Design a protein around this ligand. Structure first.
Ligand SMILES: Cc1cn([C@H]2C[C@H](O)[C@@H](COP(=O)(O)O)O2)c(=O)[nH]c1=O
Ligand SMILES: [Mg+2]
Ligand SMILES: [Mg+2]
Length: 172
């Protein structure tokens, strides 16, 4: 019943400093209903075709639909406000987002956070592994993970509504 925002990003690599954000997505429960945020990011580098393999995102898509990262980050800060942020291995997203906020002279995140993966690890002890895809199956969600920011955030949000220990902490 408390508001929260599930966040997810896609990147061109794993290094918060040297790699960059190519898509941001978020699903906000504002206390009454759901709202959504999503932007692809303009990109001037060489996207490792392994990124194309994983996400389906190409240079052509970023050129055609991408938006300036600083502008998008400013809008993202307005969308989340000071609400609790939720994710799946959320430190990955926070490390990238804070690195780029700092780079552009924007405020950094000070939001409280909850990580659905932590709750899954404690509830589903016998999972083969703890990739998001594996966790979803364990809770009766058979969707394939597309590795697109808003689509993944929707799946994480759906998962959040099925993890009782998380819901108990967010109640009231
Ligand atoms: C799964 C995976 C992700 N990544 C990067 C690119 C993805 O956009 C970003 C976040 O992953 P994700 O699709 O699960 O949300 O991390 C890699 O560089 N190699 C990988 O094997
Ligand atoms: Mg992710
Ligand atoms: Mg993703």
């Amino acid at each position: 019943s408390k508001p929260y925002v599930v966040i997810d990003i896609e990147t061109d690599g794993l290094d918060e400093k040297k790699n960059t954000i190519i898509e941001i997505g978020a699903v906000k429960f504002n206390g009454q209903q759901v709202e959504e945020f999503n932007a692809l990011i303009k990109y001037e580098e060489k996207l490792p075709p392994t990124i194309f393999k994983l996400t389906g995102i190409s240079k052509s898509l970023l050129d055609q639909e991408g938006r300036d990262l600083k502008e998008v980050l400013s809008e993202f800060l307005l969308f989340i406000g000071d609400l609790t942020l939720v994710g799946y291995n959320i430190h990955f997203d926070i490390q990238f987002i804070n690195n780029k906020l700092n780079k552009f002279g924007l405020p950094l995140l000070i939001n409280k956070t909850h990580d659905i993966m932590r709750y899954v690890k404690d509830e589903k002890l016998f999972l083969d592994n703890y990739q998001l895809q594996t966790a979803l199956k364990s809770y009766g969600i058979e969707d394939s993970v597309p590795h697109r920011a808003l689509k993944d955030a929707r799946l994480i949000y759906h998962l959040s509504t099925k993890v009782n220990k998380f819901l108990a902490r967010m109640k009231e």
